[PDB]
Amino acid sequence: GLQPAVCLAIRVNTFLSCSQYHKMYRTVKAITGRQIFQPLHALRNAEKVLLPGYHPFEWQPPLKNVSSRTDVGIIDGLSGLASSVDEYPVDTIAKRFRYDSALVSALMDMEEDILEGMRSQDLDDYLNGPFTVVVKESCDGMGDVSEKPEKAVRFSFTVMRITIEHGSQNVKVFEEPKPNSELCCKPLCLMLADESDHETLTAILSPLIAEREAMKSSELTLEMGGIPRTFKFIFRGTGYDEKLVREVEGLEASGSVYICTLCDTTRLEASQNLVFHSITRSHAENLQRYEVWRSNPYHESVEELRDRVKGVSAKPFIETVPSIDALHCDIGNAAEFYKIFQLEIGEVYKHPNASKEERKRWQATLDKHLRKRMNLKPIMRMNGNFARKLMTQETVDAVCELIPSEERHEALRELMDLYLKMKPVWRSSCPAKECPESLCQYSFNSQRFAELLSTKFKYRYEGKITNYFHKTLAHVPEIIERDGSIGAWASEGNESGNKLFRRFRKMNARQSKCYEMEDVLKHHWLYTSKYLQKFMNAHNA
Amino acid sequence: MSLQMVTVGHNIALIQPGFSLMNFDGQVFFFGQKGWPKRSCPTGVFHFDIKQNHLKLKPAIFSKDSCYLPPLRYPATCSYKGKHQYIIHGGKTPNNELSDKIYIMSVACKNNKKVTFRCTEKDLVGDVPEPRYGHSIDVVYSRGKSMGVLFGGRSYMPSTQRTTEKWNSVADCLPHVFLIDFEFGCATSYILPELQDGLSFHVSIARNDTVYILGGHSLASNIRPANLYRIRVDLPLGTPAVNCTVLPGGISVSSAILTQTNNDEFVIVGGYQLENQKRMVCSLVSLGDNTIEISEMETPDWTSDIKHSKIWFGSNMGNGTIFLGIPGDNKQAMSEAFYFYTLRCS
DNA sequence: GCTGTATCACTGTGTAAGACAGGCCAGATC
DNA sequence: GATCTGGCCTGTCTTACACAGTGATACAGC
Ligand SMILES: [Ca+2]
Ligand SMILES: [Ca+2]
Ligand SMILES: [Zn+2]
């Protein structure tokens, strides 16, 4: 016979129904006599341990503006917003937990892992020290999810580093093996709304921001392995693409003259001063600079006001860390040098102002030629597989064999090896130790790229430049000094999680458009527990 | 009884329910866009003109000295025609905070019909109200002097009962009356005995020394009563005085739309009778120096969508002209965000 | 010989909004 | 009657948006 927990990990981790499992159970029990799979209600009672809302816990002090109950389940996402005919119209459905009650189950599911970490790091298993938990938040619109459009946004988090302050220093009691994968970012709220429908987006995400600002100055006491233990938290909201950090932190839209969400520069100025910047955009500076926008205390006109406020025009309402995404940086660089391949087919340094017909021919011969050489699939939107496959030396040497002139051969090969020399020190999840020498050589490695853009490629990069290339040069040797890692602080897990939403949506629903957003949340919670993923490595352990 | 269908410019997307339409000098201006102000129209307030049922939301700019203000989504506006200007207070910002500032909105310049606005953040000092929306404010006169009378709408829960499962829950404000002087911006609250219930989305008429309030929803009882209230106000050189009276024969409609089609004769159009029954009829309120009354007009004709949609919204353009909006059915040939109509009553 | 992973060849388009620069043009202006 | 500017329109340029997943087959251990 089996535990209820193993067959729970089965029925979740291979997407059976609420009824197909009954067929499998009744056939196995009818054939082999003994029951091997636990029945349905005995599975359902074993769900409730793993959901949020089962265990006692308390805060020091009790939290301001938070209800103190411990027996909350899934709560409605509107936070009791009245949806009446007399007032503003809302039509979105959103579901969520609380934020404390999710962190409770997120810490208590990794109980064996932090205890075994305490064992392996030579410390008392009967310890009750003040742990610090580092939580990374993520949020993305994952729209066009309908069936025979409609958009949806999940806001989600990730337990990433649990660290005690023992004696004179700290120890990594728990560290996450694979940070940016799909099975270790846990769903916290989900909504059916546009990711730029700013009213409803703010109206749902403001409770979680309130609770997050609440639990930044308290402690959690929790019965953890016999004795109780205490946790304090540190939040870093990082899982955002350029659009969402550009929006909810309240800058201008993405086509602004002011580019960087970390420093303050213009593209007519960034294209000359390439690497002398720093991080000069906080969240509090952003908030008070919105205030000095709104007051206009000097009475200057709009065009130099926006010069003084450096292109802030809105009230930010979500504290983010100013930090790059890892995935979308690589996708942007990939599509950029794919377009520069398409342009250098035409060799337009010889003749400028080419027609808007021959460029389509350059695209067509690029796609046909790279399908001939390396078998790239003719697509439009660059996915992750296409992004990984385009940045090889074989393809640039192939199109180098396509292009006529000789200086373009050195100009593309040297650039490709410089870029691949730059790539893994942001691509890695711990590049401070894995390639720790080119990490130190990165300054020269970057300014050579910069000088050969500004000299041998000055036909295009004398005026405008794009966004992500400014982030690659200007910031990442300082981001490794501040935060350390790069690729761990990405949204790749959150970006990968979206297929699970669709599969859960068309395989587990009750067709009411209100419980339909309950059960996808419940199943996605039951997916990403580490108490059940420990069972799916039993054939590896 | 003159319905007319309107077509739209290139950016229909700057519409949203609960906007604000300001009438300056015959010109019409739009304030309260959807979302934060874009880069093509940085003030978020527009010269809104309509030629041959086609409208051109052109951007409007501000003065040297103005204070750029966020697009409120249900504010309280009134007409300080004493230069000509408007007063904005309250509303709900894009981040669903509730503002409580005073915004003095006037014309700074107009050269070759290119308008130039100036708004100033008049701050309230003294017995301020809580920040709220769905409230109303009228300007009023007595004995060479003038004041602002403010009656409340609804707001959030207070700062102690804000739990994060009721974080966007709302309750009616206290039935107080707020007297405001704008020479210093001083605020005096007043408790008044004949008003018992909180009211929201009501209609306020200022007959030059007396404000009549008709309609509006009471959320805590979850009904829309048919009670109108006449409020007499007078200021001596010492402390001013207020008075309330209940005059029977009102109408039970929340969030109707008012305009002035005649002097001492106003006109309200269709709102909501019940939560499922909208107000289909439309009324001409014949005012008076002391005695006012309310009669019906000759039932303006609608179309299929207006008789078919669940909701409507809109405001008045100022010159006897009502602007209305309609959601439109989504399960269609990718139908537009909103449809638009103009009502004219001659 | 048996089994447990690792490929493997398939599949699918160009949108959706939004900022910034010139080109033109058309009535306003001197 | 010349001569101007802002108004509108293109018109490119920036960020996002679907490729993961299924039978068949092939190799590496065991
Ligand atoms: Ca995104
Ligand atoms: Ca995405
Ligand atoms: Zn920068």
HEC string of B145-205 equals EEEEEEECCEEECCCCCCCCCCCCCEEECCCEEEEEECCCCEEEEEECCCCCCCCECCEEE
- Test mutation, B95, B157, B277, B330, chain A, max A CBs within 10 A: B95
- The tokens for B39 are 């880069």
Going from the Cα of A332 to the center of ligand 2, the distance in angstroms, rounded, reads: 13
Beta bridge partners of B293: B286
The span from the CA of B3 to the CA of B346, in Å, is: 11
Dihedral of the alpha carbons of A387, A391, A392, A398, in degrees to the nearest 10: 100
Of all ligands present, the nearest one to the C-alpha of A246 is: 1
Sequence-separated (6 or more) residues with CB below 8 Å from residue A259: A265, A266, A267, A270, A467, A470
The span from the CA of A517 to the CA of A502, in Å, is: 12
Q: Å between A536 CA and D29 C1'?
A: 22
**Helix orientation angle between A407-422 and A393-402, rounded to the nearest 10 degrees:** 170
Sole residue written with tokens 């709104």: A294
- Tell how many helices (H) and how many strands (E) occur in chain A: 24, 9
**Experimental method of this PDB entry:** cryo-EM
Phi, then psi, of B343 in degrees rounded to 5? -110, 135
Q: Coil, strand, or helix at residue B136?
A: strand
Q: How far is CA A402 from CA A365, A368, A377, A379, A410, in A?
A: 10, 12, 19, 21, 14
The span from the CA of B86 to the CA of A516, in Å, is: 48
- The tokens for B76 are 């309280």
A184: nearest Cα among A207, A158, A209, A206: A158
The span from the CA of A284 to the CA of A65, in Å, is: 22
- Strand nucleotide closest to residue A255 (CA to C1'): C19
The span from the CA of A209 to the CA of A196, in Å, is: 18
How many C-beta atoms surround the C-beta of residue A262 within 10 A? 23
Sole residue written with tokens 């929306």: B133
A88 inside 8 A of chain B by CB: yes
Beta bridge partners of A187: A156
The span from the CA of B290 to the CA of B288, in Å, is: 5
Dihedral of the alpha carbons of B310, B311, B317, B319, in degrees to the nearest 10: 50
Of the CA atoms within 13 Å of residue A396, those in its CB half-sphere come to 23
**Residue B294 CA to its chain's centroid (Å):** 20
Q: Please tell me the distance in Å from A83's CA to the nearest CA on chain B.
A: 10
The span from the CA of A52 to the CA of A102, in Å, is: 6
Cβ–Cβ under 8 Å, residues B71 and B31: yes
B15: nearest Cα among B38, B2, B31: B31
Tell me which DSSP letter residue B276 carries: S
A289 inside 8 A of chain B by CB: no
Max Cα distance, chain B (Å): 65
**Sheet with strand B84-90: strands edge to edge:** B61-62, B114-122, B102-111, B84-90, B75-81
- The tokens for A64 are 């301001």
Q: Coil, strand, or helix at residue A145?
A: coil
- The tokens for A379 are 């697509």
Beta bridge partners of A221: A58, A230
Sequence-separated (6 or more) residues with CB below 8 Å from residue B109: B63, B115, B116
- Tell how many helices (H) and how many strands (E) occur in chain B: 0, 28
* DSSP assignments along A302-342, one per residue: HHHHHHHTTSB-S---S-------SHHHHHHHHHHHHHHHH
* Pairing status of strand B283-286 against strand B265-269: antiparallel
A233: nearest Cα among A253, A252, A214, A219: A219
Cβ–Cβ under 8 Å, residues B313 and B257: no
* Pairing status of strand B186-191 against strand B125-126: parallel
Contact at CB, A79 and B200, closer than 8 angstroms = no
Q: Å between B281 CA and D5 C1'?
A: 50
Tell me which DSSP letter residue A537 carries: G
* Pairing status of strand B176-181 against strand B145-151: antiparallel
Going from the Cα of A142 to the center of ligand 2, the distance in angstroms, rounded, reads: 6
Residue A78 one-letter amino acid: L
The span from the CA of A173 to the CA of B212, in Å, is: 69
Tell me the H-state helices in A325-475. Answer: 327-346, 358-373, 384-390, 393-402, 407-422, 424-427, 431-434, 438-456, 467-474
Of all ligands present, the nearest one to the C-alpha of A278 is: 3
Q: Coil, strand, or helix at residue B340?
A: strand
Beta bridge partners of B8: none
Run of H or E residues at B230: strand B228-234
- The tokens for B54 are 């086609």
Cβ–Cβ under 8 Å, residues A156 and A491: no
**Residue A305 CA to its chain's centroid (Å):** 34
The span from the CA of A484 to the CA of A432, in Å, is: 7
Q: Where are the domains of chain A?
A: 4-47, 58-240+493-521, 247-308, 327-482
> Which residues of A make up each annotated binding site for a divalent metal cation?
140, 241, 495
The span from the CA of A52 to the CA of A188, in Å, is: 11
Q: Please tell me the distance in Å from B320's CA to the nearest CA on chain A.
A: 24
The span from the CA of A344 to the CA of A366, in Å, is: 10
Chain A and chain B share a number of CB contacts under 8 A equal to 125
The span from the CA of A6 to the CA of A122, in Å, is: 31
Cβ–Cβ under 8 Å, residues A15 and A503: yes
- The tokens for A295 are 């007051």
In B82-159, the DSSP E strands lie at 84-90, 102-111, 114-122, 125-126, 136-142, 145-151, 154-156
The span from the CA of A531 to the CA of A5, in Å, is: 9
How many C-beta atoms surround the C-beta of residue A319 within 10 A? 20
Q: Å between B2 CA and D22 C1'?
A: 64
**Residue A16 CA to its chain's centroid (Å):** 28
**Sheet with strand B27-31: strands edge to edge:** B20-24, B27-31, B45-51, B54-59
Q: Could you identify the residue whose CA is nearest to the C1' atom of nucleotide D11?
A: A356
Cβ–Cβ under 8 Å, residues A515 and A34: no
- The tokens for A408 are 């373009």
Tell me the H-state helices in A48-110. Answer: 100-108
Query: Which residues of chain B does A210 touch, with a Cβ-Cβ cutoff of 8 Å?
Result: 162, 164, 167
Q: Report cis status (omega within 30 of 0) of the bond before A61.
A: yes
Phi, then psi, of A155 in degrees rounded to 5? -115, 125
